[PDB]
A = this chain, B = another copy of it.
C-alpha cells in the first residue's frame, strides 16, 4: 500500500505548473513558471510554444526535487496528466520538431475577418450554420479559424503544408508531442471539440469541415479519450526524464474547464461547476446525449474515461470579465488598494441602492451574445460610493451566472442539484452568498481547491489504476478534503427586483460601433 503519486501539468493561459498528488488526492508538491503574453497588435494574443514546454519541464523537475526533499522515499510517479488552455493552437514540423511560429491564444482576435468570411462563404449569414455538428458558433476562439489564419499569413507554415510535414495542435497535442521526444501526435475528446473540426456525436473528425475551411486532414493529430495511455516521457529538457527516475507514462489529457468538472466529481447528469478565474466558465453535465441549446450556450464534450468508456457531454457558459472586473476596479480605477478591501467594502453597504453596473468590458457573452456591449453603470446619485459599485459588480457576475444557469434548460433537460465552485474569486464570501441566494441552491466550495489540476491527475490515476472506479475517487474526496458550503437566503421578491433591474440595465449597454 506504500504511497502512490500522480502528476498533473496545469498549463494555463498565464503560467504552467506541476502538481504531484498522492493516493489520498492531496497536493504534496508544486512549482509554477509563467510565460510571455505576446501582444503584437491590438486584441491579438500569442504564446511562444517552446517557452511553454520548457515551463512544463522545469515545473516537473523542481516539484519532484521538493518532494524527495520532504519524502526521501519518493522514487516514482505512476503517471502524469495534462490539463490545458483549450483552443490555443500551435504550428510545428515533424522533422525540425520545432514550432514554425508562435501560438495564437484562445481569446486572440486576428481571425476576426476569417470568421466573417466563414459565416458567409459557407454560413450564408448563419454562424450557427455548422453548430449542429461542432457544438459551436463560428467564432474567433475555436482552433480551426486560427489554424487557417496561419496557412494564409505565415510563409513558414504555408511552406509546411506545401510539403505535408505540417502539424497543427492544441496544447494537449503540442505538449504530449514534445514531452514524448517527438513520438505521440494525439489530442482528445474535449480539446478536439474546441477545434471546430470535430463532430460532437461521432467524436471523430470531419473532412467535410476540414476541406471546406481549406485545412488538410493530414496535419491533424489522432483523437483519443481523456483517460488512456498517450505515450511516455522521453525528453530531458530540464533534466526532466532523469528527475522522473523511471519509465513514466502520460495517461491523462483533458481541457482545463472539463478537467475542473472532473476534479469536482460532476459525474452525474445535471451536475455543474463554475470556475471564477479572470473569466468564469460554467459547465453542466448532461449524460451521454449531446444536448444542443438555442440560447447561445455551447455543446461540448464533458469527458470520456478510457478508450470507449461512457462519454459524457456538457453545456457551457462564460462570462469574460469576473475576476478581471475586480482587478480593473483596483488597478484602473483606484477604488481600493488591497484584495480583501473589495469584499469588506461591498459588505459595508446594505445593497446597490438602485445602481446597476454591467461589467461588460469586452462584450456580453452567455445567453445574450452582444459584442457591441461595453462596461456600463446606471442610476447613480451623489449618494453613490465605491462600496456600492464594488457590490454592484459582484451582483452583476452572479446575475449573469443566474442568467446562464436557467438558460441550461428549456428543452433542456434538467434541474440543478447545486454548484461546486472554484475560482480564487470563490474565496470571496459575499459573492458566494449572493449567487447562492440568486440561483437558490447550495454552493459547494472545496477547501482543497486545485480541482482543475486534479482532474488530469484522476484521468491518469485511473488509466494506470492508482484508483479503479469513479466510486472510489468520490469515496476518497469525501474522506480527505472538507467541502465548505453556502446556503441560499433572501426573499423571492428580492431576487426578482434585482433581475428586473438587471434586465433594464442591459437595454442600455449597447455601444461599440
Contact (Cβ within 8 A) A375 B384: yes
Looking at chain A, what size class is its interface with the partner chain?
Answer: 20 to 34
Chain B CB count within 10 A is highest, among A355, A382, A508, A509, for: A382
A72, CB-defined interface residue at 8 Å: no
The CA-CA distance from A511 to B334 in the complex, in Å, is 26
Contact (Cβ within 8 A) A374 B378: yes
Contact (Cβ within 8 A) A386 B354: no
Over the window 360-382 of chain A, the binary record of Cβ atoms lying under 8 Å from chain B Cβ atoms (1 yes, 0 no) is 01100000000000111111111
Contact (Cβ within 8 A) A509 B378: yes
Contact (Cβ within 8 A) B379 A377: no
Contact (Cβ within 8 A) B332 A511: no
A385, CB-defined interface residue at 8 Å: yes
Contact (Cβ within 8 A) A389 B333: yes
Contact (Cβ within 8 A) A381 B386: no
Using CB atoms, name the residue of chain B closest to A337: B334
Q: Given A361-B381, A508-B508, A511-B354 in contact, is the A332-B376 Cβ separation under 8 Å?
A: no
The CA-CA distance from A386 to B333 in the complex, in Å, is 5
Over the window 33-71 of chain A, the binary record of Cβ atoms lying under 8 Å from chain B Cβ atoms (1 yes, 0 no) is 000000000000000000000000000000000000000
Residues of B within 8 A of A504 (CB): 511
The CA-CA distance from A395 to B354 in the complex, in Å, is 25
Contact (Cβ within 8 A) A375 B379: yes
Query: How many copies make up the complex?
Result: 2
Residues of B within 8 A of A355 (CB): 374
Residues of B within 8 A of A238 (CB): none
The CA-CA distance from A437 to B354 in the complex, in Å, is 36
Contact (Cβ within 8 A) B375 A332: no
Using CB atoms, name the residue of chain B closest to A332: B385
Our pick among B333, B374, B378 for the contact of A381 (Cβ within 8 Å) is B374
Residues of B within 8 A of A359 (CB): 380
Min distance, Cβ A346 to any Cβ of chain B, angstroms? 14
Contact (Cβ within 8 A) A382 B512: no
Residues of B within 8 A of A375 (CB): 377-381, 384
Which 5 A-B pairs rank lowest in CB-CB distance, beginning with the nearest? A375-B380, A332-B385, A379-B511, A508-B508, A377-B377
A-B contact pairs, 9 of them (CB 8 A): A324-B382, A328-B382, A354-B512, A359-B380, A374-B380, A376-B379, A376-B508, A378-B509, A508-B508
